[PDB]
Amino acid sequence: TCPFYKKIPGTGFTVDAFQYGVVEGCTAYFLTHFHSDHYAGLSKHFTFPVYCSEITGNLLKNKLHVQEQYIHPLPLDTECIVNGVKVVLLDANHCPGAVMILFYLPNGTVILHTGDFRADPSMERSLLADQKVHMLYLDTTYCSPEYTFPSQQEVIRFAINTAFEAVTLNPHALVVCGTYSIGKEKVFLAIADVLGSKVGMSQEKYKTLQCLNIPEINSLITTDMCSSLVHLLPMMQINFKGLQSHLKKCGGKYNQILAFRPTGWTHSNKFTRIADVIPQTKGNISIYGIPYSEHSSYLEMKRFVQWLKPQKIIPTVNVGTWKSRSTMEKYFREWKLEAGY
Ligand code: NI
Numbered sequence: 001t002c003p004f005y006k007k008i009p010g011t012g013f014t015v016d017a018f019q020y021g022v023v024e025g026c027t028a029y030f031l032t033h034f035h036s037d038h039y040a041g042l043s044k045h046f047t048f049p050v051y052c053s054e055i056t057g058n059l060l061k062n063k064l065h066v067q068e069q070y071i072h073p074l075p076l077d078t079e080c081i082v083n084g085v086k087v088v089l090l091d092a093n094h095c096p097g098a099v100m101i102l103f104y105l106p107n108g109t110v111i112l113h114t115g116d117f118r119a120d121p122s123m124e125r126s127l128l129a130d131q132k133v134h135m136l137y138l139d140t141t142y143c144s145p146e147y148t149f150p151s152q153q154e155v156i157r158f159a160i161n162t163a164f165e166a167v168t169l170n171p172h173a174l175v176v177c178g179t180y181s182i183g184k185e186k187v188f189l190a191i192a193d194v195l196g197s198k199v200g201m202s203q204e205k206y207k208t209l210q211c212l213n214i215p216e217i218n219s220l221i222t223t224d225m226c227s228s229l230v231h232l233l234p235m236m237q238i239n240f241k242g243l244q245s246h247l248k249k250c251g252g253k254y255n256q257i258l259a260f261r262p263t264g265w266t267h268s269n270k271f272t273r274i275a276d277v278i279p280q281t282k283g284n285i286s287i288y289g290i291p292y293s294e295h296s297s298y299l300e301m302k303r304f305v306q307w308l309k310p311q312k313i314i315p316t317v318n319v320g321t322w323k324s325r326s327t328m329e330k331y332f333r334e335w336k337l338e339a340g341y
Contacts, residue, residue: 038115047070088102093122109134112310139316142296148299149264149293155290172254178234243257244285
């Protein structure tokens with residue numbers, strides 16, 4: 001049965017609620033982004049209206065074979081009417097095609113559902129600025145002050161400089177980047193660009209990337225591994241055994257691997273600066289864990305909420321334990337008292 005925090009009151013709407021069968025009284029199902037915990041349940045047999053971004057709708061059609069007649073893509077930053085309710089989709093600064101949803105309820109309440117997001121000051125100048133929000137359904141993934149990480153830009157600087165140094169020192173080194181879902185494409189695209197290479201990957205991953213409207217993509221990715229010195233692999237294969245095996249397969253073209261695992265947060269964040277990150281090494285294989293996050297840090301989340309001044313907050317992440325719920329509720333009260341709303 002669908003949890004309350006996926007239901008939008010005063011409407012026929014649910015958000016990211018595809019794994020509960022037919023939800024009683026749901027007339028339209030919204031999907032914020034194409035990550036499996038959120039799309040779980042969709043397939044070619046789905047026959048209710050799905051509302052989403054253009055990019056999300058490309059993925060639904062091509063990867064999950066959802067029939068076109070039930071996909072309703074909406075433009076961003078545009079007031080649209082769905083089953084008689086005004087809605088707007090806003091960029092969530094998460095993975096490609098990820099949105100936040102503004103609902104303008106018939107009785108005058110305004111509700112923001114962030115989906116998954118990485119809050120940014122740039123959001124303070126979208127259509128959010130123009131009216132009051134009463135209820136906020138918030139991505140609280142990293143809602144605790146221990147969760148600090150660098151900007152995306154510092155993390156990509158570190159990766160580019162690391163890769164460029166290594167390959168310039170040894171032109172027979174291969175760079176490998178791990179992936180398991182869409183998101184974090186900048187990691188592998190920036191490394192390939194500095195090295196003057198295309199990124200090589202499986203046919204299934206190339207298919208996924210071709211749905212994302214990234215400019216000049218035919219110029220940056222390929223399925224011809226032999227012509228590429230930056231290879232993408234499943235995140236599970238980013239370990240010494242899996243990488244030793246891969247290196248075998250390249251037929252003596254390469255004699256060293258430098259690999260990157262983009263994680264979100266890891267406890268080496270509470271001690272070490274990005275400048276100071278070092279790899280795990282075994283033989284001719286090294287592995288860097290880099291803290292490339294597509295969710296808000298604690299400080300970014302705090303700033304956004306203190307800007308928005310919602311009357312009520314509903315967390316959507318970490319809701320399963322009383323200890324987490326109590327922690328989060330204590331931070332929301334602090335933020336409210338400090339800012340004065
Ligand atoms: Ni996500």
